[PDB]
UniProtKB/Swiss-Prot annotation, chains A, B:
Function: Allosteric enzyme that catalyzes the rate-limiting step in glycogen catabolism, the phosphorolytic cleavage of glycogen to produce glucose-1-phosphate, and plays a central role in maintaining cellular and organismal glucose homeostasis.
The keyword Thylakoid is assigned to this record: no
Family annotation (InterPro entries): Glycg_phsphrylas, Glyco_trans_35, Pyridoxal_P_attach_site
Family to which the UniProt record says this protein belongs: Belongs to the glycogen phosphorylase family.
Binding site for AMP: D31, Y64, R292, R293, F294, K295, S296, S297
Catalytic activity: [(1->4)-alpha-D-glucosyl](n) + phosphate = [(1->4)-alpha-D-glucosyl](n-1) + alpha-D-glucose 1-phosphate
Name of the protein in question: Glycogen phosphorylase, muscle form
Modification sites for N6-(pyridoxal phosphate)lysine: K654
Modified-residue entries (Phosphoserine), positions: S3, S403, S487, S720, S721
A single MF term (Gene Ontology): nucleotide binding
PTM note: Phosphorylation of Ser-3 converts phosphorylase B (unphosphorylated) to phosphorylase A.
UniProt keywords, alphabetically: Acetylation, Allosteric enzyme, Carbohydrate metabolism, Glycogen metabolism, Glycosyltransferase, Nucleotide-binding, Phosphoprotein, Pyridoxal phosphate, Transferase
Entry's EC annotation: 2.4.1.1
Length: 810, 810
């Protein structure tokens, strides 16, 4: 059909068809008379999977032969989404499979919709790991992703009566064709017990054992025949576990609960024991696997030359003391030598400055669950503080500020401090974020070891986020500059010479319209809701959180509604406001925000006077697969976090690459995006980080804005009086109270400039040609945000390895 | 290699090899450089499995087309054992696979030892179901086995310090290549709730729902291209289950625990709630599946003409009231019509007369868990008793004796009475057992409905129990009479004309010697224990239970030991006494018996004076795979249960078919075996059922035997004084006390005749030629004990269907 989707050769199509029929028969044990669409999806999945195996086996054999330095990316989250289309894209099998299935009388798109998302993540942090795996494979790095195979991923979100309802994500119900269980590589992990100090060294004894069984999933690079591995551990009880008889067998669940479910929190630390067990479980199994592979290549001096461990936030921070435990207690290295190896091996990536999101574990928890690790952490702290004391003699407050151990009600271990002390590199995820780290929360550390601090601006993979989800745009682009940009996104800059090209301007606008039509149809198909495809698609999709300020968006929507009701026969650019995202189960304010959004829609969407000029829709169950549908259809991307709170953001990059203009604050990567495209091509508004600090020093008083802005006052009175909740007048009292008395994110402070900026957006939308030319300027300068660029920087500046675009013999 | 193992054609061997390499690559994702023996086993299993699929699909399509009457065998146990070799045997692929693997540089026998036993049963009852499935497929019956897919089967038995230790049987750890999950056919099962009586009919509401997911396993008939299905249900929690959030997800285990583990009791009823849930779970899911298939063929009058439900004991007895519930409550049939259909559809098989083994559920349990079923059971009882009252006016005691409801401390439901009332056929499993049923426990029922009572003597499949485990014997037999006997065991009678054939006598004896050498080697391989292959192999393998009297065997062993110590230089036929079997975890006396056996061995096996003249070995972890090894190597089969307690026995039949002579009581099938071979060719001893009754009427006093038998007295004094337990003098006080004061099984009463009979056995063993001729007379008359004969009788006399030996086009 389209160029970028590969060739549909005569031989290959014939081959695909026979293997499809083979799997349907032998693998699924069905015939065309009883097979259902799901049966067909699996037949196709196994057929495509077969094409991965050969490359997968030789890639791993290749690394064994050449023995390059290995990169281990440790993360408690891998937000993978669907795998079928992505695999076809990277193997250049899309058109061939589309043709083969077509000839078999099947619609491949219909089959792709049957696959369950691998929702092993919460949002940005988990998606970043997924994009990174893709880029590492595309750049020929010998990388391995290590995590946990959660039986239940992020919950499926249902909206009932305008409220969020959660239901288990039983994603493995029908089986996972992509994974390969490797029970032969099962490893033991220890918990509890006590420490015994003998003649030579300490010993961790009387521990409870839980087995870690690995499941391997292939990670194909883009058309380079490289297939890396993502290894996820599953918890298994030993067979002598607890060994009345029946009860002993049933109690095995206690041990296996470790890999049962993903904690649904985003940017919020919950110090639960089960979460701590998950963190140590992944770290303990992974390190044994790493050391085993290292020895199968005694000389731990070369360990840092053959191994790089990247910590995705502090979740896997226990890798530092676990590595020390193994080297000191088991391998018998002297402390100093062990510490040198550990620091040169580990690197830490920070993703937030919000205090409530930082991991600070109570000492009594570590004391009971991991007694040996607590001792090692105290020793690390002692030696670290001696260094601080020697560098800043007499600065006693610095000593208490930098300590890994926090004193107070209950003593806690600051995992971020542990990571900085035990890593040779610490990085932020966007320039402004990395600078804030050095000026605020990690200032003392930066002054002690300035060389450790770096920046690695985030990125997204252009395979899934352009070619896969927006083939139409990928096609018209390839028509002008070729296909090389797919693995070298900087080439998009060549599109600048087409900004005045009437043919291109028309094609870009046509693709957007088609995407919007397709999405508008989807909304009626699976959700039954009518929308006007000619309206401006205003969307904000991301997890629900006060710092992301979905509430500011709500204030604007209500403002637009009140303005229409005031002057009904006045023309206004039609808009479809879409907001989607999940709220953590115990995050009350976040759940109230969801209810507010649906409540607004209930009023706005049924007001005769408004007509099709304004619609407010809440996108249910936002996840990777849904993102791939709504992002290509967006006109306006809402990135309005309070300046200084969104470390980077990545959804913002996905919208920019897909033809949507951005309205946002100078926060996270928004700053670099505007810098790349030019501020004139971005809709920037609101307080800058410096402005927020000035307001805090002075004291934020929301009452002042309420008193000076009539339109704002009206909205607050509508909320308090029950205008949006007739049957429950005080339903939103908590929201009004927070906004008026304890809003940490200054929603009112950016209200005026936001509304004004939104007016400028509507003004531009009225001029199709100029709107599209600005879009072209954005797409053309989005190259810097490819995760390929990000990974190349990690490789050269942190891991010490050179990326490669060389194909492997298939 | 050998004839009965099929042809090793040039084309097929080449084909097998390429498919083996294909699976190793694509399925297991490995190469010859990293593949382990387990990897090779799986490659072979998938290769053989492929040969089953084609036949499996067409067999099921065949039944759909011809729509014959369907046979549903409901059982909570299916003791399948290994599947690889059995599949090769039934498909005539053994020699081809042996050659193909040989050419690949692999030893197939070594690979077969890697497969885990599917130990979804406890013993005889579970093994009978497995043999039956095999015979039903071989006889072309449209049969389906329905049970539960236990995550953990019968526990693995370890012997530590002479004591039984139990460990979880994690048989699915490495995956099960034979099964095929069918999540698309998942069905809901209800529990708890309450009954609501509305205008039209009652309704079961407010129930808790548990999903039943089916897993299908193919059951190949012997070389007839028929492949039936064994469908096992697995418990799954609904996704809205219990829907803090984390806890709700973890609590899903509560619902899924239903299919977690097999209750390890044998001939003993344990009224636990979880067991009741398992029983209803299998019945509820199965009946919905049956009705669904029936409708896809409104006219329930023809239901009995298209469906037959066989209840393996009372475990699935809830099928009777569940069928009534569906027909009355859901289909809206009038009670009388529904009852007619139910009775004509159901048939019940009883397997014991021991009071402690009969299921008698407390009403309060049924009341809480299955309120609607309790009501239906009371109604059934009411109408049944009205019939009894009309047939035997004024006989009030008969009414209370026959009631389904037992009064007393706590009211209970007698499930056996429920089964008789709701079934058109009730059968025992051996002639003597079926007669005892009519004269004792079911006497009142027999007098009311004599036509319902039948006998169906048990049998074993000659495929697994001869061809598979003893190819050597199968071969020399085929050499003389051909291969037809494998599916027509009665033909073995032709071997009688060879009883005086010197060549045959020599071959039979040679095969036994080779089997014994192979087993003697195995004992040193996996268990490190030296034994003399020239000694008489005396073995008793079966679950440990007081009624089976392993204790009587122990008394004989000690007697032999004391006699040797008394006259050391006197010649005695060398013996290796082997006893094996598992004890239920909470069966104290059974665990003490195991300890006694190892204790005896500890003394006997290390006494210099005894030498290699006597050895006592306890066969650890007796299971199907071990039975296939030890039975072909046995010389003497111990079947010594107290007359009237072993309903039938099946191990006895396995020994007879494999060339071992039998020493036993006139109990169960032993009676018919001796009748077939001739009492002169059997070693019968002890009390007959009539003798046991006389002793009970008079009162059994063990003291009398102790006072009159010096050798017996000596043994009891050795046990009481600590001769077999130096460090723990009173260790066996419980055993001595039971034997002397409350032995329900009269061990002492059969001691004298047993020892005398054993002397006659030793006398015959000294004459190799005559021992072997008697063996030939046994093998030649074992034809009646083929489960093919048993199933043909069930088909014609109970299910109303004709068996067929017609091949299906492959
Ligand atoms: C799961 C979760 C909870 N919370 C809040 O944490 C506060 C301090 O523990 C509580 O008082 C409040 O009720 C919670 O909704 C958040 O802010 N974000 C979150 O993701
Ligand atoms: C601590 C934390 C950060 N992040 C996000 O990680 C993304 C990838 O680095 C950033 O772009 C985004 O700004 C962050 O808020 C999450 O999603 N969950 C989290 O718990
Ligand atoms: C599991 C089990 C228990 N028991 C006995 O049941 C008796 C009555 O409940 C108990 O007093 C005794 O301690 C048990 O060992 C048996 O006989 N057979 C068995 O299979
Ligand atoms: C009640 C019951 C019977 N049986 C056996 O079933 C076999 C097959 O019918 C018989 O040969 C044998 O005599 C019985 O004791 C068991 O194994 N477990 C049991 O719980
Ligand atoms: C890209 C992505 C995110 C991150 O979006 P932000 O707006 O940066 O928070 C979260 N969820 C999904 C499903 C995503 O695809
Ligand atoms: C045949 C068999 C049984 C039944 O043996 P009996 O002596 O009749 O009780 C029990 N266990 C296994 C493993 C068997 O193969």
């Amino acid at each position: 059909q389209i160029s970028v989707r590969g060739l549909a050769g005569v031989e290959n199509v014939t081959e695909l068809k026979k293997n499809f029929n083979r799997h349907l028969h032998f693998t699924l044990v069905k015939d065309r008379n009883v097979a259902t669409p799901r049966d067909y999806y699996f037949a196709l999945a196994h057929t495509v999977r077969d094409h991965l195996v050969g490359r997968w086996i030789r890639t791993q054999q290749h690394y064994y032969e050449k023995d390059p330095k290995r990169i281990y990316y440790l993360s408690l989250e891998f937000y993978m989404g669907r795998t079928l289309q992505n695999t076809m894209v990277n193997l250049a099998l899309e058109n061939a499979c589309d043709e083969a299935t077509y000839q078999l009388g099947l619609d491949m798109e219909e089959l792709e919709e049957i696959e369950e998302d691998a929702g092993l993540g919460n949002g940005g942090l988990g998606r970043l790991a997924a994009c990174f795996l893709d880029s590492m494979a595309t750049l020929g790095l010998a990388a391995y992703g290590y995590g946990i195979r959660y039986e239940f991923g992020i919950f499926n979100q249902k909206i009932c009566g305008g409220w969020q309802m959660e239901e288990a994500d039983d994603w493995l119900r029908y089986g996972n064709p992509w994974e390969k269980a490797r029970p032969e590589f099962t490893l033991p992990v220890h918990f509890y017990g006590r420490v015994e100090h003998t003649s030579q060294g300490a010993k961790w004894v009387d521990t409870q054992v839980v087995l870690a069984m690995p499941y391997d999933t292939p990670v194909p690079g883009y058309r380079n025949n490289v297939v890396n591995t993502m290894r996820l551990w599953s918890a298994k009880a030993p067979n002598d576990f607890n060994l009345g008889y029946i009860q002993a067998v049933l109690d095995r669940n206690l041990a296996e609960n470790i890999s049962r479910v993903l904690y649904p929190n985003d940017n919020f630390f919950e110090g639960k024991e089960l979460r701590l067990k998950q963190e140590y479980f992944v770290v303990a199994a992974t390190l044994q696997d790493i050391i085993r592979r290292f020895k199968s290549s005694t000389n731990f001096d070369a360990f840092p030359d053959k191994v790089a461990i990247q910590l995705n936030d502090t979740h896997p921070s226990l890798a530092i003391p676990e590595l020390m435990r193994v080297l000191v207690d088991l391998e018998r290295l002297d402390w100093d030598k062990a510490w040198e190896v550990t620091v040169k091996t580990c690197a830490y990536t920070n993703h937030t400055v919000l205090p409530e999101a930082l991991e600070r574990w109570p000492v009594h928890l570590l004391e009971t669950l991991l007694p040996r690790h607590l001792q090692i952490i105290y020793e690390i702290n002692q030696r670290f503080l001696n260094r601080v004391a020697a560098a800043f003699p007499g600065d006693v407050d610095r000593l208490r500020r930098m300590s890994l151990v926090e004193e107070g009600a209950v003593k806690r271990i600051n995992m971020a401090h542990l990571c900085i002390a035990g890593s040779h590199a610490v990085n932020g995820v966007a320039r402004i974020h990395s600078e804030i780290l050095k000026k605020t929360i990690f200032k003392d550390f930066y002054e002690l070891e300035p060389h450790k601090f770096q920046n690695k601006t985030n990125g997204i993979t252009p395979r899934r986020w352009l070619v896969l989800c927006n083939p139409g745009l990928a096609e018209i682009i390839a028509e002008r500059i070729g296909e090389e940009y797919i693995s070298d996104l900087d080439q998009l800059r060549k599109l600048l010479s087409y900004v005045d090209d009437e043919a291109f301007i028309r094609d870009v606008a046509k693709v957007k319209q088609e995407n919007k039509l397709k999405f508008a149809a989807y909304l009626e198909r699976e959700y039954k809701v009518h929308i006007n495809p000619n309206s401006l698609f205003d969307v904000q999709v991301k997890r629900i959180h006060e710092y992301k300020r979905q509430l500011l968006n709500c204030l604007h929507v209500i403002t637009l509604y009140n303005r229409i009701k005031k002057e009904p026969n006045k023309f206004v650019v039609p808009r479809t406001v879409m907001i989607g995202g999940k709220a953590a189960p115990g995050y009350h304010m976040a759940k109230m925000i969801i209810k507010l959004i649906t409540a607004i829609g209930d009023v706005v969407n049924h007001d005769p006077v408004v007509g099709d000029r304004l619609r407010v829709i809440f996108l249910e169950n936002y996840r990777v697969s849904l993102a791939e549908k709504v992002i290509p259809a967006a006109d306006l991307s809402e990135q309005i976090s309070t300046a200084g709170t969104e470390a980077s953001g990545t959804g913002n990059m996905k919208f920019m690459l897909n033809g949507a203009l951005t309205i946002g604050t100078m926060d996270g990567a928004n700053v670099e995006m505007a810098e790349e495209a030019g501020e004139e091509n971005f809709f920037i508004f609101g307080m800058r980080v410096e402005d927020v600090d000035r307001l805090d020093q002075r004291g934020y008083n929301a009452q002042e804005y309420y008193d000076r802005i009539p339109e704002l006052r009206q909205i607050i009175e509508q909320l308090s009086s029950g205008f949006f909740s007739p049957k429950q007048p005080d339903l939103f009292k908590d929201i009004v109270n927070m906004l008026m008395h304890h809003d940490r994110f200054k929603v009112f402070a950016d209200y005026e400039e936001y509304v004004k900026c939104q007016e400028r957006v509507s003004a531009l939308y009225k001029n199709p040609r100029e709107w599209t030319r600005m879009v072209i300027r954005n797409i053309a300068t989005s190259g810097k945000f490819s995760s390929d660029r990000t990974i190349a920087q990690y490789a050269r500046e942190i891991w010490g390895v050179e990326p490669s675009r060389q194909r492997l013999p298939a």
